């Protein structure tokens, strides 16, 4: 149906390629991994200073 | 080998 009357929707894969790459990425672990860095460095600030 | 491969 699309390839007969909707040429504009012929292939949406190339236009949306970042979504495919982001699918391999686990969101929740990314925030958990990075937010630990803020926790550790803030603990360093009190450790080095006081 | 004995049962399997050549060794």
């Amino acid at each position: 149906t699309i390839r007969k009357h909707f040429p504009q929707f012929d292939n949406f894969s190339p236009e949306l390629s970042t979504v495919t790459e982001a699918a391999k990425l686990n969101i929740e672990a990314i925030e958990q991994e990075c937010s630990e860095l803020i926790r550790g460095c803030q603990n360093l600030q009190i450790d080095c200073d006081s | 080998w004995x049962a399997x491969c050549p060794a």
Partner: protein, 51 residues
């Protein structure tokens, strides 16, 4: 004895300081790229009229 027993008062804190610095020296640049990738995809899908 000269290192662990002798300096056990502040050894872990010194080790705690060193581990993070090496971690920041390595993971920080790729974390920025990972964040820039996920936000771009969210904007791309929200701004896709074909989809």
């Amino acid at each position: 004895v000269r290192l662990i027993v002798d300096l056990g008062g502040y050894w872990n804190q010194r080790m705690n300081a060193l581990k993070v610095k090496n971690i920041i020296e390595t993971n920080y640049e790729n974390l920025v790229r990972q964040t820039k990738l996920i936000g771009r995809a969210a904007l791309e899908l929200r701004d896709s009229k074909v989809f």
